[PDB]
Design a protein that fits this description.
The complex is a heterodimer of chains A (143) and B (16). With 143 residues, chain A is mainly α. Chain A has eight helices and no strands. In chain A, helix 2 crosses helix 7, helix 4 crosses helix 7 and helix 6 runs antiparallel to helix 8. Chain B has a two-stranded antiparallel sheet. Classes of the chains: A mainly alpha (143), B mainly beta (16). At the A-B interface, helix 1 of A face strand 1 of B. Chain A: This is Negative regulator of genetic competence ClpC/mecB.
Chain lengths: 143, 16
């Protein structure tokens, strides 16, 4: 599935893994994907999130409250949570339905919203960003 | 990869 990703989408997932590592987390969850979308900085997802007032520090703060720093450094390669796998699979489906044969940062964010149930979704709502508004912003920046 | 056992090239883990 990674072979469909744009270079900047690949960067999102790489940064998600680095954020999980920094937090001493044992899985790449949806919240790490959200942090990766922000860290990537330049894509439609990052720009959408900046527009909606969703900051790297706000998300990190929420993740610290909900999950907390782990005590032991994990390995270089961290597995995805089931929910994060689902998000990636849905990102593909978003792209396909919109007529794209590639997965960009926009599609990863749309997939995160489509899944809508995991830690990232909980954090977005806690930070004042209803999922529906997030999708509209993405679609808007795309149009 | 999208599973568990050993390191994918870039991100995640995979099984045999």
């Amino acid at each position: 599935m990674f072979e469909r990703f744009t270079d900047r989408a690949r960067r999102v997932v790489v940064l998600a893994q680095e954020e999980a590592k920094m937090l001493n987390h044992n899985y790449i969850g949806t919240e790490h994907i959200l942090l990766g979308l922000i860290h990537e900085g330049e894509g439609v997802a990052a720009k959408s999130l900046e527009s909606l007032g969703i900051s790297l520090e706000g998300v990190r703060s929420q993740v610290e409250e909900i999950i907390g720093q782990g005590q032991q450094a994990p390995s270089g390669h961290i597995p995805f949570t089931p929910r994060a796998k689902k998000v990636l699979e849905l990102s593909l489906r978003e792209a396909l339905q919109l007529g794209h044969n590639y997965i960009g940062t926009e599609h990863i964010l749309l997939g995160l919203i489509r899944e809508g149930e995991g830690v990232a979704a909980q954090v977005l709502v806690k930070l004042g960003a209803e999922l529906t508004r997030v999708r509209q912003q993405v679609i808007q920046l795309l149009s | 990869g999208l599973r568990r056992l050993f390191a994918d090239q870039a991100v995640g883990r995979r099984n045999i």
